[PDB]
Design a protein around this ligand. Structure first.
Ligand code: CLA
Ligand code: CLA
Ligand code: CLA
Ligand code: CLA
Ligand code: CLA
Ligand code: CLA
Ligand code: CLA
Ligand code: CLA
Ligand SMILES: CC1=C(/C=C/C(C)=C/C=C/C(C)=C/C=C/C=C(C)/C=C/C=C(C)/C=C/C2=C(C)CCCC2(C)C)C(C)(C)CCC1
Ligand SMILES: CC1=C(/C=C/C(C)=C/C=C/C(C)=C/C=C/C=C(C)/C=C/C=C(C)/C=C/C2=C(C)CCCC2(C)C)C(C)(C)CCC1
Ligand SMILES: CC1=C(C/C=C(\C)CCC[C@H](C)CCC[C@H](C)CCCC(C)C)C(=O)c2ccccc2C1=O
Lengths: 80, 39, 107, 68, 732, 61, 165, 37
């Protein structure tokens, strides 16, 4: 399973969520930004590590980070 | 005509004109002064 | 093939200097050079080059000569495109110089 | 030549020069276990300064033996 | 899940074929195993170093055994000029009778290999004369290898495991190693030379039978304890001495003559004896420097804390570096590999020009093989030095324990470092390539008198400073009225001058504008490889494209296509890109070495002087010309003894080309192809009853770069070794 | 904090525009952690010209 | 002379190479008519060859054991033995023209950064401003050392760096 | 008494060329694919 972390520089633009091809991230209530939205990664067991989320994030630097960890059958994207 | 000179002011056109000028200047120098190795 | 074709028939190209076929020797060497030059693009990746460009950009900033158009490393697909284009140009031009020098001298 | 005079004189010179004028500097820079010498000039100090004495004495003997 | 690999349960739970390759590639990276502590790390490293020692001594015992049983060593020593050294016999049942006839060269019973490794000259110089001595040496070294293997097993046992304080004791280890392992070993080798190897060259057998009854000097130990040490330099070997006999012999055991023996064209044994004796005394003195449990000695942390200059030009100086060398193992391995690679370059550079062993430098293939071998060894070791330095920066560097010292101030001005390395690389490339292309255009257009030939007056100035009377500078060793010339004249200069004014040896070869251009190409290759390696070491913590690069590690594939694309961004990838330049640079130095020595050995150095100033002369007169007998190793008319090097030449071209596939084509093509293969196997009847246990996937990106660079380098080495050995052995 | 249109300087070291000059767009007056909105005339590697910063990461210079 | 090199006017392989090139040109010449255009072209080639060898022997070049001109790159040795026109005067000529180009480019960059569209002036060249800076850049070493002595040649540490600096 | 006999290549070369590589690859393949308890 890979390691996906969310950092407090998130501005709740929801871009990372709508970029993941695997439905790993979601938006939660929060009070740290004007949008009152923060990302969260409750389903990192299905994450393949494609890093579309990191591409979609506007902040400098990134507020979502994917650390490629141990591989499984789900993280390798195997249909077999 | 203003737009044609603006197009002539673009980067590849000026690079073409300037390298034609520089190469032609070197070519005329190597013609009238054949084979300079020293001085 | 290595000895009787390539090695044997490149005699004409490698000894074409000092005659009218010398340009085929020059383009033999030049084509070998361009072919090898393609391998830098084909074997590498733009992350390294972007960081190198970062250091060079710092050096230009130090002397107030940093351009307003920000120096960027070539894209991944442009790296591949430049690679394959110089690869093809090099190889084909090599065989071109070999063929023409050979067949014009022994023809 | 006189080997015993050169070796004994070089050893005596280096042991005296480490016993009297270079003892306190070596103690300041360093800051078996106990001898009754009044300056703490123990066995390992004797070994080091006598090693330097034998080394310089045999160097003098060798350079003299080449006659150069 | 599966057992293998037992050090990583993250790899053990991998259902793919990635598990096997990543268990192989991560077996010896002990710092990142499951449950690895620091004591366990040092203990496994200590046992692994024992294992390497045992493999080295088993390798040497195998060389000795195959020379003693299958070589012609007892026949080689009688006429070492005209008899080829035999490595080992060939039993290849795939052979035919022409191959068995052609590899039965002489003087052998069957097919044998002719050695280029130079072990006969070394063994004959150090005193071997018979095969039985080599059998005794092989049995002794197999016994020593078994002892080191048992000690590697032994120091892992729980009553024999050393503590962490034993490994981090730096002063005791430097004192014992510099005293014992260097000075006592050099003193014992002086003892071997004096007691055995000098009398064997005098025609007298000294073995374990009679060494307690044969005096090395006719007055034993009376000049040593009288201090009359010049008595051991009296009556050296005459300049008409036949090596291995008593004709023209001497009595001295410790001389300093200079130059070479006249017959063997090699260094004097008494010079090497007094060499090892002097450096033995120097290392035993140097090993009494640091403070162990005896009160006297230097304290290394106090030395590092002292050397901080005023005005703050080094900041905090060397403060806090003792806890970064002693606590880190990658820093120590980087220092060790930097030193050993530079020393290996030194070994090659001083063994081609000052050949130590008897009848070396008349065996030309041995010269070329030894130089090329140790130069490529040095190149790989230097790239490993910079790689483990980048690994130090990623894993072991603590910035708070280095606040203001020299190592942090290197990270502070890293852009100026990389920029000035970029400047010298671009300068040397533009002007060296421009001068070569200019001279090629002058040679093509028929006018060689126009070509830019810059004379190397600085290295010729150095050669005149060392005593070479060809360039007419006449200063400091070349002028008779010099102080250094007059002071060194009685003792070591008359051999050095006779050997340096000979143009038939490799001692300070005559140089010119080709040598100019190639030395600047060598500077280009060194500065470029240093640029990639230093830039990988310094941008390892992070760059502006990737500020958190230290959080991913040393060897990660990429960071994805975002931010413009980040391919080859890790420090491992900078190592990967620098191995190509290392191979390039050592290829330049070995093409240059080999072609200048081929033109020396043939006689026409004018051929190198005329053709090395333009790259078509290289391609025509070194690569095309010297590969005629190589590629004629087999042909439709027959075969000869060079057919194995022709097959290995094509073999290297093939492995090179196959590595281009992994370097050019990348993963996702192959993963889609393997998915179609998985479908094709699971749908084919009567073969889908057999099914894989590990799921087939493509090679990973980092694995692709390693496999491509591996095939690339192996094909590079086999191609050049085949060409070099075949040309130098076939034409001489 | 700083006012609209004023020039500031960035002290976040892992930013693209660290040690560089931008222009303040707005400062949010809520309890947001990064209220200072600064535009930059040049874009980063992701093509973005706007970032949010804290108060101690900007200096009106 | 220097490094055991003979002068080219004294070297014998130099005259041998001159005679060999004239021999190749006259062997190519002797298969045409007298007043034809290939004959005129080859006679002009032979004239330029003789003039080039006379000019190289005139300038005091040093030839080797193969009869080719060698260059001397040491300021004091070449100024002592009269070889300053082959590396030393060419290196200061190159530094003049290279610093010319660099100073004109730097002044163009600083001139176009002070506008509302610096990149748009970088793509489409302001030709009158470029020609003005190109003519004014002849006093570039004086202006370069003056910008060096005022501290305006360098940017301070407002540069872009990485988080470990 | 060191010299191995004249038939020693004809036995030792196919031994370490075929038989010990086969035993080694078979033992390693069984060790790779073993399930953990
Ligand atoms: C980068 C290395 C390099 C260097 C140092 C040179 C240098 C030279 N080349 Mg070579 N050449 C090179 C690369 C290089 N070339 C390459 C890469 C090619 C293939 C494209 C060639 C192909 C080539 C040919 C075919 C010829 C030369 C010639 C020359 C000479 C020209 C002198 C001149 O231009 O008149 C003087 C130049 C000027 C006066 C112009 C400068 C204007 C400023 C204002 C002057 C300021 C002075 C104060 C000069 C020695 C010529 C020659 O005869 O060599 C002996 C010649 O015919 N070159
Ligand atoms: C100098 C040669 C050398 C030495 C001293 C070692 C030493 C070691 N290897 Mg390594 N290894 C080597 C070459 C070497 N290897 C080669 C050529 C390969 C194939 C690429 C490997 C692949 C390998 C694997 C797969 C494993 C080892 C393991 C080990 C360790 C356990 C020893 C054992 O008998 O099991 C020991 C440190 C094992 C280990 O457990 O390390 C922690 C282990 O699983 N090695
Ligand atoms: C380091 C390796 C080594 C070893 C094991 C030996 C051992 C020996 N040597 Mg050799 N020798 C050596 C190096 C060595 N030597 C070197 C470097 C030289 C050149 C100076 C010589 C030149 C030499 C000569 C000329 C002779 C020997 C002799 C001997 C034998 C008796 C020595 C004796 O009685 O000393 C005295 C015993 C002592 C205990 C005093 C030594 C204490 C040392 C100096 C201090 C501690 C260290 C003994 C087998 C003699 C012999 O009998 O040959 C058959 C003999 O004539 N040696
Ligand atoms: C001096 C001793 C020394 C020691 C003790 C180490 C120890 C280490 N190195 Mg270092 N290093 C060294 C020298 C050393 N290295 C040298 C000489 C180089 C230059 C090649 C390097 C370059 C280097 C890199 C780039 C890396 C290491 C890494 C490592 C660590 C793990 C090694 C591993 O598990 O891979 C196991 C090794 C293999 C599976 C080798 C595979 C086979 C290779 C590719 C060669 C294949 C050629 C083949 C044999 C030819 C056959 C031809 C055929 C026709 C016969 C370990 C700490 C790694 C690390 O620290 O990661 C953070 C790492 O990434 N080393
Ligand atoms: C023969 C093939 C080849 C060549 C010429 C180069 C050249 C270079 N490499 Mg590359 N490299 C190569 C193979 C090659 N490499 C391979 C196989 C790899 C492994 C992937 C690399 C990996 C690599 C790394 C990792 C790095 C380099 C760097 C460099 C540059 C070094 C500095 C220098 O010498 O500037 C001199 C310039 C040249 C020699 C190039 C020739 C330029 C010509 C003469 C100018 C244009 C001429 C003409 C007008 C063009 C007309 C074309 C027409 C269509 C318009 C240089 C451009 C380094 C760098 O960028 O340093 C600044 C660097 O860090 N290379
Ligand atoms: C790039 C490095 C470099 C190198 C290796 C050389 C090498 C040399 N220089 Mg040169 N030189 C250089 C650059 C270099 N130069 C530069 C940049 C300048 C301008 C400052 C000079 C100006 C110059 C003059 C005026 C003279 C030399 C001379 C020499 C030769 C002997 C010098 C000596 O013995 O002192 C050791 C070498 C050095 C310390 C290297 C630096 C050289 C400095 C700059 C000048 C040293 C001159 C020396 C003190 C005078 C010796 C007199 C001689 C009769 C014995 C030697 C071949 C002398 C000569 O012509 O001998 C035949 C001489 O008279 N050089
Ligand atoms: C416009 C003027 C200009 C100036 C003053 C500089 C200055 C510098 N460059 Mg940069 N550079 C430039 C343009 C410039 N560069 C261009 C156009 C490129 C290619 C895209 C580069 C690519 C580059 C690299 C890769 C490196 C440098 C380096 C350097 C530094 C060392 C000198 C050198 O080696 O340059 C060598 C020159 C080049 C490599 C290319 C120059 C091309 C032409 C001749 C200059 C451009 C003319 C310009 C378009 C004229 C417009 C004026 C007109 C509109 C009025 C120095 C600070 C090096 C460094 O960082 O060391 C500290 C270094 O490694 N430069
Ligand atoms: C270690 C270095 C080494 C190398 C590279 C070789 C290479 C060779 N040996 Mg030699 N051998 C060696 C040491 C070596 N030997 C030693 C020290 C002895 C004395 C015991 C022998 C006794 C010997 C005989 C009797 C014969 C050979 C033969 C050969 C040739 C055919 C291969 C073979 O079947 O050998 C087989 C190897 C042995 C019989 C001894 C090796 C035993 C050691 C302990 C193995 C070490 C294990 C190793 C480190 C790791 C293996 C496991 C790993 C691969 C997974 C080949 C040239 C044959 C030959 O001459 O053909 C013409 C042959 O008949 N060897
Ligand atoms: C008690 C007393 C006293 C006395 C004292 C004395 C007498 C002392 C002495 C001491 C001594 C007497 C010491 C010695 C020491 C020595 C040593 C310690 C040595 C060492 C040596 C060495 C180390 C050597 C080495 C070598 C060799 C072996 C070889 C050659 C080289 C050389 C030389 C290096 C008095 C009276 C004052 C007073 C009272 C008290
Ligand atoms: C990355 C890294 C690293 C690495 C680095 C390296 C790898 C380096 C290399 C280095 C090197 C590789 C160096 C070298 C050096 C050398 C030298 C510096 C030398 C010098 C010499 C001399 C000085 C000599 C002189 C002389 C002569 C010439 C003759 C006369 C006499 C005499 C002897 C005086 C480390 C680990 C730190 C860690 C951190 C990171
Ligand atoms: C060398 C290399 C680069 C660096 C190459 C670059 C950045 C291209 C440089 C082209 C020219 C030299 C720069 C533009 C020159 C301008 C026209 C400026 C004017 C210059 C005047 C002299 C005309 C990559 O960006 C790259 C990316 C992906 C995979 C491989 C590679 C790769 O191998």
């Amino acid at each position: 399973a890979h390691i996906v972390k969310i950092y407090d520089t998130c501005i709740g633009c929801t871009q990372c969520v709508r970029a993941c091809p695997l439905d790993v991230l979601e938006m939660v209530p929060w009070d740290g930004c004007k949008a009152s939205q923060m990302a969260s990664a409750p389903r990192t067991e299905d994450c393949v590590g494609c890093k579309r989320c990191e591409t979609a994030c506007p902040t400098d630097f990134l507020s979502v980070r994917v650390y490629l960890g141990s591989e499984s059958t789900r993280s390798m994207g195997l249909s077999y | 005509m203003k737009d044609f000179t603006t197009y002539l002011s673009t980067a590849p056109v000026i690079a073409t004109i300037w390298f034609t000028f520089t190469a032609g200047l070197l070519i005329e120098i190597n013609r009238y002064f054949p084979d300079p190795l020293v001085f | 093939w290595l000895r009787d074709f390539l090695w044997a028939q490149s005699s004409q190209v490698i000894q074409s200097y000092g005659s009218a076929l010398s340009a085929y020797g020059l383009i033999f060497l030049g084509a070998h050079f361009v072919w090898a030059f393609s391998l830098m693009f084909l074997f590498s990746g733009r992350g390294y080059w972007q960081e190198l460009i970062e250091s060079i950009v710092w050096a230009h900033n130090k002397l107030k000569v940093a351009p307003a158009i920000q120096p960027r490393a070539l894209s991944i697909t442009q790296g591949r495109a430049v690679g394959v284009a110089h690869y093809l140009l090099g190889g084909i031009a090599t065989t071109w110089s070999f063929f023409l020098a050979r067949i014009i001298s022994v023809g | 030549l006189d080997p015993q005079i050169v070796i004994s004189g070089s050893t005596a010179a280096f042991l005296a020069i480490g016993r009297f004028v270079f003892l306190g500097y070596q103690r300041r820079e360093a800051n078996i276990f106990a001898t009754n010498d009044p300056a703490g000039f123990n066995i390992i100090d004797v070994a080091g300064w006598g090693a330097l004495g034998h080394a310089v004495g045999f160097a003098v003997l060798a350079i003299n033996s080449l006659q150069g | 899940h599966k057992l293998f690999p037992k050090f990583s349960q993250g790899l053990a739970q991998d259902p793919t074929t990635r598990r096997i390759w990543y268990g192989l590639a991560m077996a010896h990276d002990f710092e990142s195993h499951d449950g690895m502590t620091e004591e366990n790390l040092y203990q496994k490293i200590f046992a692994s170093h024992f294992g390497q020692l045992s493999i080295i001594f088993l390798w040497t015992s195998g060389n000795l055994f195959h020379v003693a049983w299958q070589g012609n060593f007892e026949q080689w020593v009688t006429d070492p000029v005209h008899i080829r050294p035999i490595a080992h016999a060939i039993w290849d049942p795939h052979f035919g009778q022409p191959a068995v006839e052609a590899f039965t060269r002489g003087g052998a019973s069957g097919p044998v290999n002719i050695s280029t490794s130079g072990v006969y000259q070394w063994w004959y110089t150090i005193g071997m004369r018979t095969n039985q001595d080599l059998y005794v040496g092989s049995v002794f070294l197999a016994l020593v290898s078994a002892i080191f293997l048992f000690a590697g097993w032994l120091h892992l046992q729980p009553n024999f495991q050393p503590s962490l304080s034993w490994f981090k004791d730096a002063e005791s280890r430097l004192n014992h190693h510099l005293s014992g392992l260097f000075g006592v070993s050099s003193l014992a080798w002086t003892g071997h030379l004096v007691h055995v190897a000098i009398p064997e060259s005098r025609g007298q057998h000294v073995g374990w039978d009679n060494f307690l009854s044969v005096l090395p000097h006719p007055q034993g130990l009376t000049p040593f304890f009288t201090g009359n040490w010049a008595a051991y330099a009296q009556s050296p070997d005459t300049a008409s001495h036949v090596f291995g006999t008593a004709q023209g012999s001497g009595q001295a055991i410790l001389t300093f003559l200079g130059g070479f023996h006249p017959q063997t064209q090699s260094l004097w044994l008494t010079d090497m004896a007094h060499h090892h004796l002097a450096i033995a005394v120097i290392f035993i003195v140097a090993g009494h420097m640091y403070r162990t449990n005896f009160g006297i000695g230097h304290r290394m942390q106090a030395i590092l804390e002292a050397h901080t200059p005023p005005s703050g030009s080094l900041g905090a100086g060397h403060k806090g570096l003792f806890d970064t060398v002693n606590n880190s193992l990658h820093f120590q391995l980087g220092l060790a590999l930097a030193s050993v690679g530079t020393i290996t370059s030194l070994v090659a550079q001083h063994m081609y020009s000052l050949p130590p062993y008897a009848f070396q430098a008349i065996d030309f293939t041995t010269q070329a093989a030894l130089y090329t071998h140790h130069q490529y060894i040095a190149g790989f070791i230097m790239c490993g030095a910079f790689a483990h330095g980048a690994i130090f920066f990623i894993r072991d560097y603590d910035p708070e324990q280095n606040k203001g010292n020299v190592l942090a101030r290197m990270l502070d001005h890293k852009e100026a470092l990389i920029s000035h390395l970029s400047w010298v690389s671009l300068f040397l490339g533009f002007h060296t390539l421009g001068l070569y292309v200019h001279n090629d255009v002058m040679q093509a257009f028929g006018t060689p008198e126009k070509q830019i030939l810059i004379e190397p007056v600085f290295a010729q100035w150095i050669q005149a400073a060392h005593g070479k009377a060809l360039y007419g500078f006449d200063f400091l060793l070349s002028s008779k009225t010099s102080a250094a010339f007059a002071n060194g004249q009685s003792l070591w200069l008359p051999g050095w001058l006779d050997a340096i004014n000979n143009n038939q040896n490799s001692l300070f070869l005559t140089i010119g504008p080709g040598d100019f251009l190639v030395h600047h190409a060598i500077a280009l290759g060194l500065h470029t490889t240093t640029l990639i390696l230093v830039k990988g070491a310094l941008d390892a913590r992070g760059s502006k494209l990737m500020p958190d690069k230290k959080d991913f590690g040393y060897s990660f594939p990429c960071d994805g296509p975002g931010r413009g694309g980040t391919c080859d961004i890790s420090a491992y990838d900078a190592f990967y890109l620098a191995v190509f330049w290392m191979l390039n640079t050592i290829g330049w130095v070995t093409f240059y070495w080999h072609w200048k020595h081929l033109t020396l050995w043939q006689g026409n150095v004018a051929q190198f002087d005329e053709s090395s100033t333009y790259l078509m002369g290289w391609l025509r007169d070194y690569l095309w010309l010297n590969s005629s007998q190589l590629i004629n190793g087999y042909n439709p008319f027959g075969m000869n003894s060079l057919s194995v090097w022709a097959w290995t030449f094509l073999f290297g071209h093939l492995i090179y080309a196959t590595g281009f596939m992994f370097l050019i084509s990348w993963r996702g093509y192959w993963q889609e192809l393997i998915e179609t293969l998985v479908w094709a196997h699971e749908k084919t009847p009567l073969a889908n009853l057999v099914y894989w246990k590990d799921k087939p996937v493509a090679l990973s990106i980092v694995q692709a770069r390693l496999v491509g660079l591996a095939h690339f380098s192996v094909g590079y080495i086999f191609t050049y070794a085949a060409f070099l050995i075949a040309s130098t052995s076939g034409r001489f | 904090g700083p006012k609209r249109g004023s020039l500031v300087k960035i002290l976040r070291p892992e930013s693209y525009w660290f040690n560089q000059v931008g222009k303040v767009v707005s400062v949010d007056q809520s309890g947001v952690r990064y209220p200072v909105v600064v535009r930059f005339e040049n874009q980063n590697y992701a093509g973005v010209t706007t970032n949010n910063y804290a108060l101690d990461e900007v200096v009106a210079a | 002379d220097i490094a055991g090199l003979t002068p080219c006017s004294e070297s014998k392989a130099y005259a041998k190479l001159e005679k060999k090139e004239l021999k190749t040109l006259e062997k190519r010449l002797k298969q045409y008519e007298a007043d034809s255009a290939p004959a005129v072209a080859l006679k002009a080639t032979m004239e330029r060859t003789k003039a080039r060898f006379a000019n190289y022997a005139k300038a005091g070049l040093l030839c080797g054991n193969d009869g080719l001109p060698h260059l001397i790159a040491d300021p004091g040795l070449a100024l002592k033995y009269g070889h300053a026109g082959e590396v030393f005067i060419p290196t200061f000529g190159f530094l003049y023209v290279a610093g010319y180009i660099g100073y004109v480019g730097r002044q163009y960059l600083i001139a176009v950064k002070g506008e509302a569209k610096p990149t748009d002036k970088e793509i489409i060249i302001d030709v009158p401003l470029a020609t003005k800076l190109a003519w004014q850049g002849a006093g570039w070493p004086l202006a370069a050392v003056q910008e060096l002595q005022r501290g305006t040649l360098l940017e301070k540490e407002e540069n872009i760096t990485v988080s470990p600096r | 008494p060191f010299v191995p006999p004249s038939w020693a290549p004809s036995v030792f070369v196919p031994l370490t060329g075929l038989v010990l590589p086969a035993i080694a690859m078979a033992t390693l393949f069984v060790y790779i694919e073993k399930e953990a308890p």
